[PDB]
From Swiss-Prot:
GO terms for biological process: dolichol phosphate mannose biosynthetic process; dolichol-linked oligosaccharide biosynthetic process; GPI anchor biosynthetic process; polysaccharide biosynthetic process; protein O-linked mannosylation. The chain crosses the membrane at residues 233-259, 265-289, 297-323, 329-353. GO terms for cellular component: plasma membrane. PANTHER family: DOLICHOL-PHOSPHATE MANNOSYLTRANSFERASE SUBUNIT 1. The keyword Magnesium applies. It comes from Pyrococcus furiosus (strain ATCC 43587 / DSM 3638 / JCM 8422 / Vc1). This is Dolichol-phosphate mannosyltransferase. It is a multi-pass membrane protein. It catalyses: a di-trans,poly-cis-dolichyl phosphate + GDP-alpha-D-mannose = a di-trans,poly-cis-dolichyl beta-D-mannosyl phosphate + GDP. Mn(2+) binds at D94, Q96. Mg(2+) binds at D94, Q96. Its EC number is 2.4.1.83.
Length: 355
C-alpha cells in the first residue's frame, strides 16, 4: 500500500558515522517501499552535509544545509517544507531511535491515526541504561506539560523526537521555530483527531558527542508558557485570580457584617467563607470557564468545594513548612497563598470543569 510516499526527516549536527548504520537500518526496515530521507543540517563543522550526499548513490537521500539558520525544531520545520511525502517520519540520527519500529508507526498511520508517537512511557516502552532518578525527572518534566496543557493530558511522551504524521496535520499550520520540542508544538497547533502512542526502546547513542543535554529544560518551560498563552490557559488563570481576589473581599465583607449584626466572631467566620466560596464559583462558571461547563451545575459546585478546601490545606502546610525552614513569615504567607491559587486552578481546570 505504501506506494504513497514516506519522508523520513532527520535533523543533524555533527552526526557522522551514524549515517552509515542509520541509512542502512532505515533502508532495511522500509524495504521496497516508496520513501526518501531528508537530512537537514545546520552547516556542521564536522564533515557532513556532504557525507550524506555520497550515500545518495546508495540511498534515496535529499540533503539540506541551512547556514543562515540554526536550531532543532527549526530544522524539522524546514524538513516539513522540503519533504514531498504523504507521511512524515521524524527521528534522530544517533540510533537512539530504532529505524526498525518505523514500520509500526506508519502502520498506525495507515490504520487511521493522524499522528503516531514513538513513546518511551506507554506499556511496552523502554529506555535502556537509565537511572530511575533520571527517568522520573523525565516523567516529572513531562507531567508538568500534561497538567498545564489539558489537550495533551493523556499523552505519556509528548516530548519525544520520534513520531510520524500525515502531511495534512501540519499543512497550512504555523509552527513556532524556537526550541527543541516540535512534537509538543504539533500536538497543540496541528490538525488531527486521532493520536496513538507506539512503544519502542530508547537506545544508547552509539557514537558521537551529545548536543542537548542539558539545555532543554528552561526552553521547555518557556515553551509551555507560550503554548499556555496560545491555548487560552493563561487568560483563564488571570480571570481565576481576579475572581479569587473578589472572594477574599467578599469573605471579609460578610465577616465584618456578621459581628455588628450580633453574631459572635468565630461562629461568623464559617458563613462568611462559604459565601466567598459560592461567590467564587458563580463568577468562574459564567466567566472563567463559561465555555467548558458540563453536567449538572450542582456537581460542579461540589467539586469546586474540594478544590477550595485543597487550596486551604496546601496553604496551611506550605506555610508551616517554610516557617520551620526559617523563611520570614510574610514570604511564607505569600508563597502559601500563591501555591493555593495554583492548586485550586489545576483541580478546577482538570476536575470541576474538565475537558
Ligand atoms: N539541524 C540541527 N540538528 C540538530 C540540532 N541538535 C540536534 N540535532 C540533532 O537532533 C538529534 C538530538 O541530539 P541528541 O544529542 O541525540 O539529543 P538527545 O539528548 O538524545 O534527546 C532526544 O530525546 C529527547 C527526549 O528523550 C527529545 O526531546 C529530543 O528531541 C531528542 O529526541 C540529533 O540527531 C542531533 O544531530 C540542531 O541544533 N540543528
Ligand atoms: C484587580 C485588577 C484587575 C481588574 C479587572 C476587573 C475585571 C475586568 C473586567 C472583566 C469584565 C469585562 N467583560 C467584557 C467580561 O464584561
Ligand atoms: C459574561 C459575564 C461577564 C462577567 C464580568 C466579569 C466578572 C468579574 C466580577 C469579579 C470582579 C470583582 N472585583 C472585586 C475584582 O472587582
Ligand atoms: C469542614 C471545615 C472546613 C475548614 C476549612 C476552611 C475552608 C477555607 C476556605 C478558604 C476560602 C476563602 N476564600 C477567600 C479563598 O474564598
Ligand atoms: C458582602 C457584604 C458587604 C458588606 C459591606 C461591609 C462594609 C465594609 C466594612 C467597613 C470597614 C470597617 N473596617 C473595620 C474594615 O475598617
Ligand atoms: C506536614 C504538616 C505540617 C504541620 C505543621 C504543624 C504546625 C506546628 C505549629 C507550631 C506552633 C503553633 N502552635 C500554636 C500549635 O503552637
Ligand atoms: Cl477559588
Ligand atoms: Mn540522542
Amino acid at each position: 500500500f505504501q506506494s504513497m510516499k514516506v519522508s523520513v526527516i532527520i535533523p543533524t549536527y555533527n552526526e557522522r558515522e551514524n549515517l552509515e548504520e542509520l541509512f542502512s537500518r532505515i533502508d532495511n526496515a522500509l524495504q521496497g517501499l516508496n520513501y526518501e530521507i531528508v537530512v537537514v543540517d545546520d552547516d556542521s563543522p564536522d564533515r557532513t552535509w556532504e557525507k550524506a550526499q555520497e550515500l545518495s548513490s546508495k540511498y534515496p537521500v535529499k540533503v539540506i544545509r541551512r547556514t543562515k539558520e540554526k536550531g532543532l525544531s527549526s530544522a524539522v520545520i524546514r524538513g516539513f517544507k522540503e519533504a514531498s511525502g504523504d507521511v512524515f517520519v521524524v527521528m534522530d540520527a544517533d540510533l537512539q531511535h530504532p529505524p526498525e519500529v518505523i514500520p509500526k508507526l506508519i502502520e498506525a498511520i495507515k490504520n487511521g491515526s493522524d499522528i503516531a508517537i514513538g513513546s518511551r512511557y506507554v506499556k511496552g516502552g523502554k529506555v535502556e541504561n537509565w537511572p530511575f532518578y533520571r527517568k522520573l525527572i523525565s516523567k516529572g518534566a513531562i507531567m508538568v506539560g500534561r497538567i498545564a496543557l489539558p489537550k495533551i493530558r493523556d499523552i505519556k511522551d509528548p516530548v519525544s523526537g520520534f513520531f510520524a504524521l500525515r502531511k495534512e496535520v501540519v499543512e497550512g499550520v504555523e509552527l513556532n521555530p524556537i526550541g527543541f520540542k516540535i512534537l509538543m508544538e504539533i500536538l497543540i497547533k496541528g490538525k488531527y483527531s486521532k493520536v496513538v502512542e507506539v512503544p519502542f526502546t530508547f537506545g544508547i547513542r552509539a557514537r558521537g558527542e551529545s548536543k542537548l543535554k542539558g539545555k532543554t529544560i528552561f526552553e521547555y518551560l518557556r515553551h509551555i508558557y507560550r503554548l499556555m498563552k496560545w491555548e487560552g490557559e493563561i487568560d483563564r488563570i488571570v480571570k481565576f485570580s481576579i475572581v479569587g481576589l473578589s472572594g477574599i473581599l467578599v469573605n471579609e465583607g460578610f465577616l465584618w457584617l456578621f459581628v455588628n449584626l450580633g453574631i459572635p466572631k468565630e461562629i461568623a467566620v464559617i458563613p462568611a467563607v462559604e459565601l466567598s466560596i459560592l461567590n467564587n464559583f458563580f463568577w468562574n462558571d459564567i466567566w472563567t470557564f463559561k465555555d467548558i461547563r458540563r453536567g449538572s451545575i450542582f456537581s460542579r459546585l461540589l467539586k469546586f468545594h474540594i478544590a477550595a478546601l485543597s487550596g486551604a490545606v496546601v496553604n496551611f502546610i506550605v506555610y508551616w513548612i517554610l516557617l520551620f525552614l526559617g523563611i520570614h513569615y510574610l514570604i511564607a504567607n505569600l508563597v502559601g497563598i500563591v501555591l493555593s491559587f495554583g492548586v485550586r486552578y489545576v483541580i478546577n481546570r482538570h476536575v470541576t470543569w474538565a475537558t
